[PDB]
């Protein structure tokens, strides 16, 4: 079971602050340290700081401007990171990781995508992508779903509630006028559709919305 | 603070060949180096700890070596699932630090793209909008050009493209091209066509549909 | 069981406790100090033992005030503990020799 | 007397495995380590691993793909190296060496030439090389023997059972259509032949054959 649970996203206005959480499960030792790593789009892993919950002591990366404050709650086994007075430079995925006091990060959280912007949250509109009438099919058929007009990132697209993983491409989003848009592609044996159902599940953590969209032949 | 140099930043290899990633520390750190694998949109994953100790759950083709200032992460017979970014990290001195990372690319056989064009949905039209989507799937090399044509004439306005990173499933690339215009302009046109020009063929692969 | 043997045992258990707490506390004190190497528990425990025995190879040592204070406690606990075993051995020999002399 | 004895060759099919042996004689100490070194044609010495027979512990080179498994037999004073699932990349001479636990290889074995190929073993045909009738001789005469059509390498060519070492050249073999061929040359005072016999001894360890061939004047 997931050892470290982090919220998917957080929208923050420039100047404002946010408190990210990291709920841990599994084995817990007094020698455990919870670390936080920052990763900006396209860049590498940058260490932010660490904290030892059993004692409450926290250390921070001295090479970068201090934006975080780490605390921990032993009773709820949760570690927190307060990011304050953010700017677009603080927009990135923030991972929490657990180290058993022996130097390596044995487990990482899924990460929370933080977006620092003035724009407003906007859930995505999900439209189906079924072949046209004159489209000739082969031994395989390609279907998809359009995820348009959302903010901020990200969205998680699955097929048939995750049971359909092979033959799936979810293209990187494209930003235009404070709104993102992407499409996801799925390919299955032409003989299996529409006999066997195909549905895309779109989760947009920033707005707590998860919508489904069944792909049916055009007619 | 210990600087970890990972060079080259990108490594290209043919399927099945043995590949090695380099990690050089600015000072001696014994064997306190650890390696992580990070796939597109995934979180980092521990591969090797203390330079050469294997982790359970990690394929046997993964091994590490070295001590002092020079370390190596090796993959025996690389396959598509190995496509990702690889980072080294040191725990010899405070603070822990990470290397800049090396990307693994696999040079597979050339593959023509699978083109699929999609008319806008009934649901979308209802909102006064129309997006015509086209997929250029699973091709290799990554270089490819897409051209739109409306009623026989090339169209460029309203087109937005997106390219995936190399696919960890088959070492191919895919790209999407989306033409977006008001329901109105969409309604005053008949045929929409998407054409893909790829190294795999002199003639373009074309898919169209009439409203 | 005579006193000296009891104190020896107690000294031993206490040393073990000092080693474990010392290892834990050294890491706590040293992390946060750029350049520190006494920062992971396994080697910290080894550092605590080679400090308690006063061998001091020099492969690991504290660079902070509190790490050093922790080191002093470990050193003193080790010296005291082993010194106490020596005193117990002396008492044992003194007793045996007094008997052998018929006193 | 030879301290380390190794078989001359081993033919192995790609994918198959082979168990090389190293029988040691002479002084044996509990502090002895038997090492294995790999040397591909034209290349240098590459350390494979080591083992301490007195304890049975073995260590291996971490920089290369693990192909070996070292074991030892204290009663027969023999060290073994199991090479498994070989490819042409594993074709090379494999030496065993003894180290007294003080860091240097005081003694090395003659080495076993391992060839990974699908071809079949083939002993060599040995033909004599005596001067033609119109060949004018000087104070010295040159004779030889042709070692044709063998596989795999190697072959050891001696003259007069090894008693004739001076004036001998054995050319490197040449590979053509899964078969090797080489010639060996010997030069002796023209006055000594054919009065004093000259014979070439050809051993082909891969097929357990050792044949002789006397060189007599053409007539
Ligand atoms: C006198 C204390 C000075 C502490 C300091 O301002 O110095 C603080 C300094 C921080 O690096 O630590 C150090 O070198 C100080 C190490 C002092 C060790 C004292 C051991 C007494 C028994
Ligand atoms: C003997 C008491 C040792 C206490 C160590 C506390 C370390 C705090 C570091 O900031």
According to CATH, what is the number of the domain D119-217? 2.60.40.10
Paired residues of B167 in beta bridges: none
Q: Rounded to whole angstroms, how far apart are CA atoms A179 and A152? A: 7
Q: Are residues B146 and B210 in the same domain?
A: yes
Q: Is C65 in the pocket of ligand 1 (CB under 6 A)?
A: yes
Q: Rounded to whole angstroms, how far apart are CA atoms A201 and C41? A: 45
Q: Is C52 in the pocket of ligand 2 (CB under 6 A)?
A: no
CATH of the domain at B181: 2.60.40.10
Domain span at residue C83 reads 1-103
- Which tokens hold the place of B158? 């309203």
* D152 in Cβ contact with D117 (< 8 Å): yes
Q: Rounded to whole angstroms, how far apart are CA atoms D13 and D115? A: 8
Q: Are residues B102 and B123 in the same domain?
A: no
- Which tokens hold the place of A58? 């926290």
Record: contact B65-D62, CB cut-off 8 A: yes
- Of all protein residues, whose CA lies closest to atom 21 belonging to ligand 1? C69
* B53 in Cβ contact with B100 (< 8 Å): no
Distance in Å, alpha carbon of C33 to nearest chain A alpha carbon: 9
A57 shares contact with chain C (CB less than 8 Å): yes
Cα separations in angstroms, A100 against A61, C8, C39, C43: 19, 34, 12, 13
* B115 in Cβ contact with B204 (< 8 Å): no
* A32 in Cβ contact with A53 (< 8 Å): yes
Q: Are residues B150 and B65 in the same domain?
A: no
* Chain-centroid distance, C-alpha A80: 18
Interface test with C, best of B94, B95, B97 (most C CBs within 10 A): B94
Total structural domains in chain C?
1
Q: Are residues B29 and B61 in the same domain?
A: yes
Q: B–D contact (≥3 CB pairs within 8 Å)?
A: yes
User: Please, which residues have CB within 8 angstroms of residue D182's CB and are 6 or more apart in sequence?
Assistant: D147, D155, D157, D170, D171, D172, D173, D174
C86 shares contact with chain B (CB less than 8 Å): no
B197 shares contact with chain D (CB less than 8 Å): no
Experimental method: X-ray
B168 shares contact with chain A (CB less than 8 Å): no
- Which tokens hold the place of A1? 């079971």
- Of all protein residues, whose CA lies closest to atom 7 belonging to ligand 2? C29
Domain span at residue B99 reads 1-108
Total structural domains in chain B?
2
Q: Which of B108, B134, B154 is the last residue before a domain boundary? A: B108
Record: contact A102-C40, CB cut-off 8 A: yes
Pairing between strand A78-83 and A68-73?
antiparallel
Cα separations in angstroms, C11 against C6, C73, C88, C93: 8, 14, 11, 20
Interface test with D, best of B70, B74, B77 (most D CBs within 10 A): B74
Sequential DSSP letters for B46-63: EEEETTTEE-TTS-TTEE
* D136 in Cβ contact with D105 (< 8 Å): no
- Which tokens hold the place of B200? 């795999």
Spell out where D33-170 has E strands. Answer: 33-39, 46-52, 57-60, 68-73, 78-83, 92-99, 105-108, 112-116, 125-129, 140-150, 156-159, 168-170
Closest CA to D32 of D78, D64, D69, D66: D78
- Which tokens hold the place of B49? 């700890």
Option in A45, A131, A148 nearest B87 (CB)? A45
Q: Are residues B47 and B123 in the same domain?
A: no
| Chains in contact with D, counting 3 or more C-beta pairs less than 8 Å apart as contact | B
Record: contact A103-B1, CB cut-off 8 A: no
Q: Is C43 in the pocket of ligand 1 (CB under 6 A)?
A: no
Nearest CA in chain B to A213: B123
Tell me the backbone φ, ψ of residue D169, rounded to 5 degrees: -125, 130
Q: Rounded to whole angstroms, how far apart are CA atoms D171 and D175? A: 13
Closest CA to B76 of D87, A104, D40: D87
Q: Rounded to whole angstroms, how far apart are CA atoms A99 and A87? A: 29
Q: Where are the alpha helices (DSSP H) in chain B?
A: 122-125, 183-187
* CATH 2.60.40.10 holds for A1-118: yes
Nearest CA in chain A to B49: A104
Resolution in Å, one decimal place: 2.2
Q: Where are the alpha helices (DSSP H) in B49-177?
A: 122-125
- Which tokens hold the place of A17? 């602050």
* B15 in Cβ contact with A86 (< 8 Å): no
Q: Is D94 helix (H, G, I), strand (E, B) or coil?
A: strand
Pairing between strand B114-118 and B129-139?
antiparallel
Distance in Å, alpha carbon of B147 to nearest chain D alpha carbon: 48
Q: For residue D65, which residues of chain B lie inside 8 Å, CB to CB? A: 18, 63, 74, 76
User: Please, which residues have CB within 8 angstroms of residue C85's CB and are 6 or more apart in sequence?
Assistant: C8, C11, C12
Q: Are residues B86 and B165 in the same domain?
A: no
* B186 in Cβ contact with B211 (< 8 Å): yes
* D107 in Cβ contact with D37 (< 8 Å): no
Cα separations in angstroms, A109 against A4, A17, A161, D95: 5, 21, 21, 50
The residue extents of the domains of chain D are 1-118, 119-217
Chain B, residues 126-145, CB within 8 A of chain A, namely 127, 131, 133, 135, 137
- Which tokens hold the place of C40? 């992971």
CATH of the domain at C57: 1.10.287.70
- Of all protein residues, whose CA lies closest to atom 13 belonging to ligand 1? C65
Distance in Å, alpha carbon of B76 to nearest chain A alpha carbon: 23
User: Please, which residues have CB within 8 angstroms of residue D169's CB and are 6 or more apart in sequence?
Assistant: D184, D185
Q: Are residues B48 and B126 in the same domain?
A: no
């Amino acid at each position: 079971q997931v050892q470290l649970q982090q919220p998917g996203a957080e929208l923050v206005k420039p100047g404002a602050s946010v408190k990210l959480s990291c709920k841990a499960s599994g084995y817990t030792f007094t020698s455990d340290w919870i670390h936080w790593v920052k990763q900006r789009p396209g860049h590498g892993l940058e260490w932010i700081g660490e904290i030892i919950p059993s004692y409450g002591r926290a250390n921070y990366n001295e090479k970068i401007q201090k934006k975080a404050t780490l605390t921990a709650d032993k009773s709820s086994s949760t570690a927190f990171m307060q990011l304050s007075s953010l700017t677009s430079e603080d927009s990135a995925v923030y991972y929490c990781a657990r180290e058993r006091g022996d130097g390596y990060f044995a487990v990482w959280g899924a990460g929370t995508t933080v977006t620092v912007s003035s724009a407003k949250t906007t859930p995505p509109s999900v439209y189906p992508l079924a072949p046209g009438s004159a489209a000739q099919t082969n031994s395989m058929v390609t279907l998809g779903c359009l995820v348009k007009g959302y903010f901020p990132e990200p969205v998680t697209v699955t097929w048939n509630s995750g049971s359909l993983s092979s033959g799936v491409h979810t293209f990187p989003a494209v930003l235009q006028s404070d709104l993102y848009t992407l499409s996801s592609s799925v390919t299955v044996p032409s003989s299996s559709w529409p006999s066997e159902t195909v549905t895309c599940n779109v989760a947009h953590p920033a707005s707590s919305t998860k919508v489904d969209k069944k792909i049916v032949p055009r007619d | 603070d210990i600087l970890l140099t990972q060079s080259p930043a990108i490594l290209s290899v043919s399927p099945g060949e043995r590949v090695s990633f380099s990690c050089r520390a600015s000072q001696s750190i014994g064997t306190d180096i650890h390696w992580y694998q990070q796939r597109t949109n995934g979180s980092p994953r521990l591969l090797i700890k203390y330079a050469s100790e294997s982790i359970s759950g990690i394929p046997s083709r993964f091994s590490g070596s070295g001590s002092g200032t020079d370390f190596t992460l090796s993959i025996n017979s690389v396959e598509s699932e190995d496509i990702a970014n690889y980072y080294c990290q040191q725990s010899n001195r405070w603070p822990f630090t990470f290397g800049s990372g090396t990307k693994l690319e696999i040079k597979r056989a050339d593959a023509a793209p699978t083109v699929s064009i999609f008319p806008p949905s009934s649901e979308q039209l209802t909102s006064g909008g129309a997006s015509v989507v086209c997929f250029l799937n699973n091709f290799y090399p990554k270089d490819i050009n897409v051209k739109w044509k409306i009623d026989g004439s090339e169209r460029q306005n309203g087109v937005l493209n997106s390219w995936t990173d190399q696919d960890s499933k088959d070492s191919t690339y895919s790209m999407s091209s989306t033409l977006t215009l008001t329901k109105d302009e969409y309604e005053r046109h008949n045929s929409y066509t998407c054409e893909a020009t790829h190294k795999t063929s002199t003639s373009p692969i074309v898919k169209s549909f009439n409203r | 069981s005579a006193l000296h043997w009891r104190a020896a045992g107690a000294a031993t258990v206490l040393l073990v406790i000092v080693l474990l707490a010392g290892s834990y506390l050294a890491v706590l004190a040293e992390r946060g100090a750029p350049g520190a190497q006494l920062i992971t528990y396994p080697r910290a425990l080894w550092w605590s033992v080679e400090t308690a025995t006063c061998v001091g190879y020099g492969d690991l040592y504290p660079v902070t005030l509190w790490g050093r204070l922790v080191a002093v406690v470990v050193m003193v606990a080790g010296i005291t503990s082993f010194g106490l075993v020596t005193a117990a051995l002396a008492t044992w020999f003194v007793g045996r020799e007094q008997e052998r002399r018929g006193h």
